[PDB]
A paper describes a structure:
NDCBE (SLC4A8) mediates Na+-driven Cl‾/CO32‾ exchange and belongs to the Na+-dependent group of the solute carrier family 4 (SLC4) transporters. NDCBE exchanges one Na+ and one CO32‾ ion for one Cl‾ ion4,5. Na+‒driven Cl‾/CO32‾ exchange activity plays an important role in pH regulation in specific cells throughout the brain, kidney and the rest of the body. SLC4 monomers consist of a large C-terminal transmembrane domain (TMD), involved in transport mediation, and a smaller N-terminal cytoplasmic domain (CD).
In this work, we report the cryo-EM 3.4 Å structure of the OF conformation of NDCBE (SLC4A8), which shares transport properties with both AE1 and NBCe1 by mediating the electroneutral exchange of sodium-carbonate with chloride. The cryo-EM map reveals that NDCBE is a dimer with each monomer comprising 14 TMs (TMs 1-14), five amphipathic helices (H1-2, H7-9), and a C-terminal cytoplasmic helix (H10), together with the loops connecting all these helices including the long EL3. The TM helices can be divided into two structural domains, the core domain (TMs 1-4 and TMs 8-11 with H1-2 and H7) and the gate domain (TMs 5-7 and TMs 12-14 with H8-9), which are separated by a cleft on the extracellular side of the protein, providing ion transport cavities between the core domain and the gate domain. TM3, TM10 and the antiparallel β-sheets preceding the two helices in the core domain have been proposed to contribute to substrate coordination in AE110 and NBCe111. This region in our surface-rendered NDCBE atomic model presents as an extracellular-facing cavity where solvent can access from the extracellular side to the ion coordination area, suggesting an outward-facing state (OF). Na+ is coordinated by the hydroxyl oxygens of Thr804 and Thr847 and forms an ionic bond with the carboxyl group of Asp800, with coordination distances of around 2.4 Å, 2.6 Å and 2.6 Å, respectively. A CO32‾ oxygen is coordinated by the backbone amide group of Gly539 and also by the sidechain hydroxyl group of Thr538 with coordination distances of 4.0 Å and 2.9 Å, respectively. In the NDCBE structure, EL3 forms a relatively rigid domain-like structure consisting of four short α-helices (H3‒H6) and one pair of anti-parallel β-strand. EL3 is stabilized by two intramolecular disulfide bonds, Cys636‒Cys684 and Cys638‒Cys672, as well as hydrogen bonds between the anti-parallel β-strand. Dimerization in EL3 is supported by formation of hydrogen bonds between the carbonyl oxygen of Asp629/hydroxyl oxygen of Ser632 and the amidogen nitrogen of Val669 from the neighboring subunits.
Residue numbers in the entry:
A (entry chain B), B (entry chain A): 451 to 1021
The structure:
Amino acid sequence: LFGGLVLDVKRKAPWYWSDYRDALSLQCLASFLFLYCACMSPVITFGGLLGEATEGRISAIESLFGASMTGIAYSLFAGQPLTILGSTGPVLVFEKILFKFCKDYALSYLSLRACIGLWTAFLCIVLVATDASSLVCYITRFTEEAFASLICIIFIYEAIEKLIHLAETYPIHMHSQLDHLSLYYCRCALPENPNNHTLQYWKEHSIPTADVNWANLTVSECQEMHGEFIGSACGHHGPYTPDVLFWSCILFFATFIVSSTLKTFKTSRYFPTRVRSTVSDFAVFLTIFTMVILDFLIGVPSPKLQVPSVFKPTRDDRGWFISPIGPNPWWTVIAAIIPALLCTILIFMDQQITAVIINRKEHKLKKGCGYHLDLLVVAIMLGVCSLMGLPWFVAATVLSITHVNSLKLESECSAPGEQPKFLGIREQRVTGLMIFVLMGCSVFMTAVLKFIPMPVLYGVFLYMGVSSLQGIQFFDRLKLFGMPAKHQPDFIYLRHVPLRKVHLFTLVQLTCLVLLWVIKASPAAIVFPMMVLALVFVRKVMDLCFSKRELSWLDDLMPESKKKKLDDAKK
Amino acid sequence: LFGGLVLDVKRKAPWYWSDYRDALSLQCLASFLFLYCACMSPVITFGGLLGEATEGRISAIESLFGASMTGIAYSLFAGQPLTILGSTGPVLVFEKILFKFCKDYALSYLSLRACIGLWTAFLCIVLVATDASSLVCYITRFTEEAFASLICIIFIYEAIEKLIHLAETYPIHMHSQLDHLSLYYCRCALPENPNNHTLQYWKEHSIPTADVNWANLTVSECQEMHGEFIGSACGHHGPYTPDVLFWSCILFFATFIVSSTLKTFKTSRYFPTRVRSTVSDFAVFLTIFTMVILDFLIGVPSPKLQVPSVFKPTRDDRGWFISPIGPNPWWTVIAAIIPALLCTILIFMDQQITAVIINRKEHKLKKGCGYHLDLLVVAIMLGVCSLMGLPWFVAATVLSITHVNSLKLESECSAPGEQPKFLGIREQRVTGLMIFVLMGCSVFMTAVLKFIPMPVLYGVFLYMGVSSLQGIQFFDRLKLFGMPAKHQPDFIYLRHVPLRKVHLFTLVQLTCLVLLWVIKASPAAIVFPMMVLALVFVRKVMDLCFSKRELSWLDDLMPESKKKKLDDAKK
Ligand code: NA
């Protein structure tokens, strides 16, 4: 109820200091380096992708600042501070819709977006007052996993989409004809039967004496007269990249084989435990390090994550921090209630589901946890980031899970080679702080990531997407389609529910994935969070479609390993 | 004594028909398909490499003809049908020196080599008459593993090394730095301040008015015209290749990863076992299938394997069948006894050590073998090859072993995935025949391998090298010196033979390996076989340096498999 959220803080304050001294060097150092690089790339790409859309009033710097701020407060005042936030599809689409709505009565974007951001923030406060942890517990595995797994796959989907997309901006000579190598050339030249736009572009910009200069230009230079890249070395607007496409694929493919090699070192027998694990958690940093040397030696001009080195608010119509919201006539502010209310619901439900996925019996919880405090800290930080007109980041699934696995407490007497002991997972509360502090300080740090190529981070991302789901029981079953039925291990959840019913839960769950997939692909697509509601309604039905016993074997709330221990000790 | 190799044939007669009907498709098909390709490129690089050496007296086709016969007869008429007689170092150097010796008193090269070939054939005939078999016992695991490990290590190195050479002969740019890509050029041009060498080459070949040609000649034409390549894309003699390095590396890595993935699919569990196992054997065939297709589609010119379709003598002044030697001074033929005596010794020991390495009991077969038959068919094949003026071939290590490992019976009764029972190996002896049958018929066909570039054959080569060294006990151990003794792998040495004693033995084995290694690298390298002699002498000394019980564990002529059975049935 109202004033019952105090109990969360009271129940985490004795533990608060005790969770700093928990932290160690040689593990956290590595986790911080890993998450620092990981977290930086989506913020910048998102900031840019969003920059074009909301017409140059938002850019890399605005996303960097809001992201620094958010990370610093979240890692301090969260009742589950192990979620490492990252943007999602509803925000990106929502902003575009806000933008399309903001093409009439469009006197300031910023004042309208602060009014919308404030209404949804304050509403998130109204939700934590009433009924934020009075319904949350009604959920079960079907829906939480349908949501988690589907999202995780998109993580992989855009890792690949990122690579294939590059393939469009970097083409190749499709048959080299080396004998004709010395004949290859490409020069810029004037349009032949030129379009009006090229025509208008040339006239109104006033370029004098272009003929002495048109015989050969640099790559940027031709793009500014809009001329044809004519030659036998031109098959697309972008010249024929010799090697970027095919090196990029080598970087991409080598990372996903090598990164998996490094994380499985933990169970190797060739060393004692002390030099083993410590090679197996520097992994992402070593893969960044070696692909960096290979790229340095044999110089392919492969893309990198670039960050600007100039510090400013963009468009000269922003202060660093700007309070005023007067320009829109007053009524629009009142009219914003219906979108901000749809958003407070999508934001609320995203957050809470993600909290449910952290607060399972996987990634064991040692101490108590709070829903209301978690929601409180996103709601206050959403309100202030919106008050400074900066980008929003919401608790993402795969990021939280990989953050939680990198730092971890493990036994002092490990079995010879085989049988590593999980023995919990760490919560420090200081690397989350430092990551977003050091990424805040990287407005003027441009050298460190510029070298770090884009492809190696893309592999890191896809590997991340794959390894989060090794603990999600559903994917295991998804991969059981071509597998025979006598070939699996004991898997108690298989022995007392028929094969026909196992496949039948996988087909239906897969149907709702396919259903999500098409709603995501609609030119609206914001129904998706609210779809988790329907996945609960339908779920209840299924007790009658199939026996209640028949779901107490799969969705069963306690994890499969424990029930294997339990049922074997009964017999 | 004499006529004592007859027992081998008497012991190979009973099995004769049963070892064709033993033969089964898809485990033999795939092996043939991978080998056909593998063996042709091996006898093609050695025939063209001898061609430059013998001023075009011996050709690759002469090499194809000798190879087709050498293999065809051997797989019919030997005592081990899984040995493949490959293009080996000793031949080349012998032929060099011989060519160098036939510059004083060397009117004819072909007749002199044929006389030596008949003499060394003859020397193996008196050797094979008496005691070919008895002296085999003096060779043991020490020497054979030392010898073998080095050969496989070298083979792996020249897979990688050959690839480096391709990048060296098709030069690459350190940095493209794309903006100036379009600015780059290189055109052929007349030599300025011409060197005496190109001055001379130009003059005597009589090619007038090259100035009108040298505005811009093609890469092939300029590179044999000794003209200077002048431009910004020529830092060196030839323009930088856009795509050859990265495409060759993609074929190389890809082939090395997919064949080893596929070959371990036996111990994966995605399908019923019967349809599982068939896929793994053809994987080499599958890597070939898909890479030929991919290169067919988007082409990157890279060197491709061609064979002379035209069936002829070389230089059109030498008869096919040639003639019996007679023109040379009679005495030179008698003088050839000493070089040929040297040759016989090395040929007998090189042959015999490879045959010992195949006829291990960890390499056991459900059939016999005959050393004396193998030398005998080698001796016939050595005389006929020499009388017809063709290249000789001595037993190569990796080819014979990758044959053996590629086809092996393995049980399908096993538990799914892990533990596929070893159940001996497979010696049908019908694939060797079928390989060499198809390259014999594929001497006037060239269309088959013109569409397979070298790099993919090189990735096959790297897979051959890595997978081959399975059976070598020593290399396993070298890789266990890092492993501690807390959870050390089960090697017999820990309780029966002290770590100190295993180490002293491995260090002395390694020193004699490094000594065989420097000997190989020596500008003679005739001395490589006689060293094997020394490896015995040194073996004897240790009979006073150590108890004999403590060395019967790793140099046993009964495998570990038997010791594991014995020592487990005692306790
Ligand atoms: Na999300």
